[PDB]
Design a protein around this motif. Structure first.
Motif, PDB file in Angstrom:
ATOM      1  N   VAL C 131      -7.810 -37.495  13.302  1.00 18.09           N
ATOM      2  CA  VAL C 131      -6.790 -37.753  12.293  1.00 18.09           C
ATOM      3  C   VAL C 131      -6.426 -39.230  12.273  1.00 18.09           C
ATOM      4  CG1 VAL C 131      -4.470 -37.188  11.526  1.00 18.09           C
ATOM      5  CG2 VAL C 131      -5.919 -35.430  12.562  1.00 18.09           C
ATOM      6  N   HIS C 132      -6.449 -39.825  11.087  1.00 20.43           N
ATOM      7  CA  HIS C 132      -6.150 -41.247  10.951  1.00 20.43           C
ATOM      8  C   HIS C 132      -4.647 -41.503  10.908  1.00 20.43           C
ATOM      9  CE1 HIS C 132      -6.194 -45.354   9.339  1.00 20.43           C
ATOM     10  NE2 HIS C 132      -7.430 -45.421   9.796  1.00 20.43           N
ATOM     11  N   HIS C 133      -4.208 -42.542  11.614  1.00 18.38           N
ATOM     12  CA  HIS C 133      -2.804 -42.945  11.641  1.00 18.38           C
ATOM     13  C   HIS C 133      -2.642 -44.438  11.348  1.00 18.38           C
ATOM     14  CE1 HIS C 133      -1.087 -39.214  13.387  1.00 18.38           C
ATOM     15  NE2 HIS C 133      -2.290 -39.090  13.901  1.00 18.38           N
ATOM     16  N   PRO C 134      -2.468 -44.811  10.077  1.00 21.15           N
ATOM     17  CA  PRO C 134      -2.347 -46.170   9.586  1.00 21.15           C
ATOM     18  C   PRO C 134      -1.164 -46.884  10.237  1.00 21.15           C
ATOM     19  CG  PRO C 134      -2.670 -44.594   7.784  1.00 21.15           C
ATOM     20  CD  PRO C 134      -2.421 -43.785   9.037  1.00 21.15           C
ATOM     21  N   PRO C 135      -1.273 -48.201  10.432  1.00 24.59           N
ATOM     22  CA  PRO C 135      -0.248 -49.094  10.936  1.00 24.59           C
ATOM     23  C   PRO C 135       0.813 -49.406   9.887  1.00 24.59           C
ATOM     24  CG  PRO C 135      -2.231 -50.318  10.337  1.00 24.59           C
ATOM     25  CD  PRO C 135      -2.552 -48.849  10.143  1.00 24.59           C
ATOM     26  N   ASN C 136       0.490 -49.137   8.627  1.00 24.53           N
ATOM     27  CA  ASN C 136       1.369 -49.500   7.527  1.00 24.53           C
ATOM     28  C   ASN C 136       1.122 -48.624   6.307  1.00 24.53           C
ATOM     29  OD1 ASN C 136       2.428 -51.318   5.154  1.00 24.53           O
ATOM     30  ND2 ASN C 136       3.252 -52.178   7.042  1.00 24.53           N
ATOM     31  N   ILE C 137       2.177 -48.392   5.536  1.00 22.21           N
ATOM     32  CA  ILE C 137       2.076 -47.604   4.315  1.00 22.21           C
ATOM     33  C   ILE C 137       1.123 -48.250   3.320  1.00 22.21           C
ATOM     34  CG2 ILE C 137       3.968 -48.726   3.089  1.00 22.21           C
ATOM     35  CD1 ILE C 137       3.188 -44.918   3.129  1.00 22.21           C
ATOM     36  N   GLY C 138       0.986 -49.571   3.401  1.00 25.99           N
ATOM     37  CA  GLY C 138       0.092 -50.302   2.519  1.00 25.99           C
ATOM     38  C   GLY C 138      -1.354 -49.860   2.695  1.00 25.99           C
ATOM     39  N   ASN C 139      -1.736 -49.525   3.926  1.00 26.92           N
ATOM     40  CA  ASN C 139      -3.102 -49.099   4.193  1.00 26.92           C
ATOM     41  C   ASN C 139      -3.279 -47.633   3.848  1.00 26.92           C
ATOM     42  N   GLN C 140      -2.214 -46.858   4.000  1.00 23.78           N
ATOM     43  CA  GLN C 140      -2.258 -45.453   3.620  1.00 23.78           C
ATOM     44  C   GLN C 140      -2.573 -45.344   2.131  1.00 23.78           C
ATOM     45  OE1 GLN C 140      -1.351 -42.063   5.645  1.00 23.78           O
ATOM     46  NE2 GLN C 140      -2.982 -42.233   4.125  1.00 23.78           N
ATOM     47  N   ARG C 141      -1.990 -46.248   1.349  1.00 22.62           N
ATOM     48  CA  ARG C 141      -2.276 -46.305  -0.074  1.00 22.62           C
ATOM     49  C   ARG C 141      -3.664 -46.883  -0.347  1.00 22.62           C
ATOM     50  N   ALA C 142      -4.008 -47.976   0.325  1.00 23.11           N
ATOM     51  CA  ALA C 142      -5.284 -48.638   0.072  1.00 23.11           C
ATOM     52  C   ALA C 142      -6.478 -47.730   0.359  1.00 23.11           C
ATOM     53  CB  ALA C 142      -5.396 -49.898   0.914  1.00 23.11           C
ATOM     54  N   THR C 163      -0.094 -34.142  10.696  1.00 22.37           N
ATOM     55  CA  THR C 163       0.482 -35.105   9.774  1.00 22.37           C
ATOM     56  C   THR C 163       0.358 -36.490  10.386  1.00 22.37           C
ATOM     57  OG1 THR C 163       2.701 -34.858  10.721  1.00 22.37           O
ATOM     58  CG2 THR C 163       2.092 -33.382   8.914  1.00 22.37           C
ATOM     59  N   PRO C 164       0.216 -37.529   9.567  1.00 18.48           N
ATOM     60  CA  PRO C 164       0.154 -38.916   9.963  1.00 18.48           C
ATOM     61  C   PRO C 164       1.512 -39.443  10.394  1.00 18.48           C
ATOM     62  CG  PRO C 164       0.163 -38.699   7.565  1.00 18.48           C
ATOM     63  CD  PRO C 164       0.083 -37.296   8.130  1.00 18.48           C
ATOM     64  N   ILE C 165       1.499 -40.336  11.371  1.00 18.77           N
ATOM     65  CA  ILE C 165       2.671 -41.110  11.740  1.00 18.77           C
ATOM     66  C   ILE C 165       2.389 -42.569  11.450  1.00 18.77           C
ATOM     67  CG2 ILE C 165       4.209 -41.820  13.600  1.00 18.77           C
ATOM     68  CD1 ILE C 165       3.286 -39.167  15.048  1.00 18.77           C
ATOM     69  N   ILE C 166       3.063 -43.125  10.454  1.00 20.23           N
ATOM     70  CA  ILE C 166       2.774 -44.492  10.052  1.00 20.23           C
ATOM     71  C   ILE C 166       3.730 -45.462  10.715  1.00 20.23           C
ATOM     72  CG2 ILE C 166       2.583 -46.097   8.136  1.00 20.23           C
ATOM     73  CD1 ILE C 166       1.895 -43.602   6.383  1.00 20.23           C
ATOM     74  N   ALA C 167       3.175 -46.309  11.568  1.00 18.69           N
ATOM     75  CA  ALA C 167       3.963 -47.255  12.340  1.00 18.69           C
ATOM     76  C   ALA C 167       3.066 -48.313  12.953  1.00 18.69           C
ATOM     77  CB  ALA C 167       4.739 -46.530  13.431  1.00 18.69           C
ATOM     78  N   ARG C 173      -7.407 -52.959  21.622  1.00 18.15           N
ATOM     79  CA  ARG C 173      -8.745 -53.174  21.078  1.00 18.15           C
ATOM     80  C   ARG C 173      -8.657 -53.789  19.682  1.00 18.15           C
ATOM     81  N   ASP C 174      -7.711 -54.715  19.529  1.00 21.05           N
ATOM     82  CA  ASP C 174      -7.470 -55.451  18.291  1.00 21.05           C
ATOM     83  C   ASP C 174      -6.966 -54.583  17.136  1.00 21.05           C
ATOM     84  N   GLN C 175      -6.628 -53.327  17.413  1.00 15.76           N
ATOM     85  CA  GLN C 175      -6.132 -52.447  16.359  1.00 15.76           C
ATOM     86  C   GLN C 175      -4.624 -52.263  16.416  1.00 15.76           C
ATOM     87  N   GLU C 176      -4.022 -52.078  15.245  1.00 17.91           N
ATOM     88  CA  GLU C 176      -2.605 -51.749  15.145  1.00 17.91           C
ATOM     89  C   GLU C 176      -2.406 -50.264  14.848  1.00 17.91           C
ATOM     90  N   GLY C 177      -3.452 -49.616  14.335  1.00 14.43           N
ATOM     91  CA  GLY C 177      -3.390 -48.192  14.008  1.00 14.43           C
ATOM     92  C   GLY C 177      -4.079 -47.361  15.086  1.00 14.43           C
ATOM     93  N   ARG C 178      -4.107 -46.043  14.900  1.00 13.66           N
ATOM     94  CA  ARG C 178      -4.736 -45.149  15.872  1.00 13.66           C
ATOM     95  C   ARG C 178      -5.502 -44.006  15.214  1.00 13.66           C
ATOM     96  NH1 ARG C 178      -3.035 -48.842  18.337  1.00 13.66           N
ATOM     97  NH2 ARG C 178      -2.019 -48.843  20.378  1.00 13.66           N
ATOM     98  N   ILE C 179      -6.488 -43.472  15.931  1.00 16.06           N
ATOM     99  CA  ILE C 179      -7.146 -42.230  15.530  1.00 16.06           C
ATOM    100  C   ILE C 179      -7.090 -41.197  16.645  1.00 16.06           C
ATOM    101  CG2 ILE C 179      -9.314 -41.130  14.894  1.00 16.06           C
ATOM    102  CD1 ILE C 179     -10.085 -43.826  13.523  1.00 16.06           C
TER     103      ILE C 179
END
Ligand SMILES: *[C@@H]1O[C@H](CO)[C@@H](O)[C@H](O)[C@H]1NC(C)=O
Ligand SMILES: *[C@@H]1O[C@H](CO)[C@@H](O)[C@H](O)[C@H]1NC(C)=O
Ligand SMILES: *[C@@H]1O[C@H](CO)[C@@H](O)[C@H](O)[C@H]1NC(C)=O
Ligand SMILES: *[C@@H]1O[C@H](CO)[C@@H](O)[C@H](O)[C@H]1NC(C)=O
Ligand SMILES: *[C@@H]1O[C@H](CO)[C@@H](O)[C@H](O)[C@H]1NC(C)=O
Ligand SMILES: *[C@@H]1O[C@H](CO)[C@@H](O)[C@H](O)[C@H]1NC(C)=O
Ligand SMILES: *[C@@H]1O[C@H](CO)[C@@H](O)[C@H](O)[C@H]1NC(C)=O
Ligand SMILES: *[C@@H]1O[C@H](CO)[C@@H](O)[C@H](O)[C@H]1NC(C)=O
Ligand SMILES: *[C@@H]1O[C@H](CO)[C@@H](O)[C@H](O)[C@H]1NC(C)=O
Lengths: 263, 263, 263
Positions: C131-142, C163-167, C173-179
């Motif tokens: 499950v993908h968990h974006p660092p920002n709502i902007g990426n959830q949209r993109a 459900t995703p947790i956006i934060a 590992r240079d990432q702000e998001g998580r899977i």
């Protein structure tokens, strides 16, 4: 005392599977025997929460009384209690788990309920209940007259909220929907409260357990630690026996040296 | 080294129960002793998440430092920190867990907070916090000026969201509401972030552990596997001793056959 | 048969970490060796659910076949399958886990999917997904053209909603998001259904296991109970040997008393 269980699972025995003739004057036990691939275990398909912990925790029990917690005839005066299906058909008649009541609406709109029980048995009480998960929104409406419902269960030391997941599942036991099962334990003096506005498989019967002093909290992690501890003690005992015989073998050798010295 | 714990639980000791005089210059230990039915354990009623894993994981610890993570006076400049109640009354005065701060609003509307900590102790850090669960919507409004709130906790390797369940519970320790407790571990170089708009029992103190090399990850499943492995080695050792003595008994018998042959 | 695993974790091996050259003609094993602090384990940062249970359950396996469950070229005709990033860079090229496909939108709005698989391998099937968990709502949209998405997974005996947790998380590992990663097992005759409208890391490959008869359900609690049971039997055997030698030592002593009586 392995119990009389045949081609049944623990879940079938405690939930009240119509095909498990286990409702006899049987009290305490020291271990529970069950069939790994039972025929009279699952009655209506679904997930049983913390099954491993429940079967492990119940491994050692003293007095075991089955009693009514929320009597069918009086606990839900204006609810439908004829919650039966082909899944639990017994002798050709539609039925359900004996210790559970699947509630639905009638006449008007399915009303919301709030019921509670106080533990005055001087025993720990095991309460079983479930949550309905319709295959389709059409049935969610047909049964509870709603497109949205929740089940809230709280007790002296328990807080959980359940929600339905409406989806068509793979066909199991001719069903497209599922019923999940959950359980808690009450101590003497505690209370349990059930609040729901739909999808509740209500508790009817509950089990009052004396349990005894053959275990601690009953968590499976403790039961296993107990066995390991017990083994460690056996090891120390045998180690002492080894030192004992090594000493004696030494002395007996000495005489063998001397009887030889005499000749 | 069983520690000095008396009529306290592990939770009471690490949460900071006012009645547990354990705040002394005590460092490492090899096992934790606690009372199964403590008086100074629970201060304010609620569920402690993964309690068994925490008490098991902490069974073996090296250096054990208690330090401030989010100092009371500076971490929440415009929040109420006088979060006290009769539940934790100490010497007649209302109080709370020493290592926790129950935050509420004042003057205007309870503001939302976002705080973080970076682990630069070269030790693993145990962070404890809780979630408030009001008995009534009236208190949810009175305390946080809202009918809806959430608590978000994330860290290098942790993602969890908590929500309040508002309901009247059975009376425990004179309370109708509950506070649940949760915890995580941070490694050197990691970070933890707390975001909330209500119902947060904030962390104040945290524990920096060296732990040592007497365990692996510390999960209880590994600790138990270690004990079993250790036993297996003892068994091989004793088996070798058995073969040793069987051989010697054989030889000593032979001489018994011969000393007899001499006569 | 410890397997050939080097500086890899179990997760890296089964997820398909580009740096783990484990894709060889290797079948059964009796134990899995892995590096506690691997370099080729985690490819893209996140939490692996029930990792301990999976590595424990897989400790004993017979035939082990890797096969396609949802072929890249045909399973998602109008989805983007070029789900790659620097996190899994291999030989300078952006990539991802070999057994997984990170789906995104293109051209228009990311469409919703519903896919299923029926187990006809006569083996148990292990299915991995995330499950993908974006660092920002902007990426959830993109990525998925939405501010809200869910992932629903059901099977013959499984019901879970993610459900995703956006934060913004701490940089790993240079990432702000998580899977995050999740897994289930299917029995012959079962079915699994995947429904999602965003944030799905789809399964591509799955493992068909014969497993064998060296274990029961495979739950780690059973595997450990098996070891303890096995030890108990060894203890009874050695106890019998002790009684045997004590008796013989007794008899040999008697002769020592008599050879003495003769003189
Ligand atoms: C259990 O199944 C076996 C056949 O496998 C049958 O012979 C036996 O009578 C069954 N026992 C019960 C209680 O149904
Ligand atoms: C239904 O029963 C409840 C008690 O369980 C009662 O409070 C409620 O008024 C009843 N409703 C009707 C229409 O009788
Ligand atoms: C649910 O409870 C509310 C009171 O809180 C009541 O007004 C409503 O009619 C109940 N729902 C149904 C279907 O009766
Ligand atoms: C624990 O309780 C016992 C009585 O059961 C009391 O004698 C003892 O002093 C108590 N210890 C502490 C530390 O309170
Ligand atoms: C409250 O404190 C926060 C910092 O924690 C600050 O950003 C905010 O502006 C303050 N609000 C007021 C009204 O002072
Ligand atoms: C919550 O945060 C938002 C900014 O995201 C702010 O506008 C709002 O006023 C905060 N809530 C309160 C009660 O201050
Ligand atoms: C594992 O790391 C060591 C250095 O710590 C290295 O020598 C070895 O070649 C590595 N093995 C693999 C398979 O990368
Ligand atoms: C996208 O593919 C699905 C089948 O996976 C199909 O049902 C749908 O109509 C397609 N949409 C478009 C715009 O081609
Ligand atoms: C999601 O599914 C619905 C049908 O249930 C469809 O109308 C909608 O367009 C789908 N979403 C997208 C982005 O295609």
């Amino acid at each position: 005392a392995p119990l009389q269980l045949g081609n049944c699972s623990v879940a079938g025995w405690i939930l009240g599977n119509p095909e498990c003739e286990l409702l006899i004057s049987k009290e305490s036990w020291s271990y529970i025997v069950e069939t790994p691939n039972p025929e009279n275990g699952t009655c209506f398909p679904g997930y049983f929460a913390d099954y491993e912990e429940l079967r492990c925790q119940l491994s050692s029990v003293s007095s075991f009384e089955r009693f009514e917690i929320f009597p069918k005839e009086s606990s839900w005066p204006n609810h439908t209690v004829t919650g039966v299906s082909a899944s639990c058909s017994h002798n050709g008649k539609s039925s359900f788990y004996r210790n559970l009541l699947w509630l639905t609406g009638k006449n008007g709109l399915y009303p919301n309920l709030s019921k509670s029980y106080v533990n005055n048995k001087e025993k720990e009480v095991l309460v079983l209940w479930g949550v309905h998960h319709p295959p389709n929104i059409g049935n969610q409406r047909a049964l509870y007259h709603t497109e949205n419902a929740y089940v809230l269960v709280v007790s002296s030391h328990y807080d959980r909220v359940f929600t339905p997941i409406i989806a068509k599942r793979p066909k199991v036991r001719d069903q497209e929907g599922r019923i999940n099962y959950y359980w808690t334990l009450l101590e003497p003096g505690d209370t349990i409260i059930f609040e729901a506005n739909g999808n509740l498989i209500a508790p009817w019967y509950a089990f009052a357990l004396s349990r005894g002093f053959g275990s601690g909290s009953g968590s499976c992690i403790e039961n296993i630690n107990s066995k390991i501890y017990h083994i460690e003690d056996k090891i120390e005992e045998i180690n002492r026996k080894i030192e004992h015989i090594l000493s004696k073998i030494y002395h007996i050798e000495r005489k063998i040296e001397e009887i030889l010295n005499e000749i």
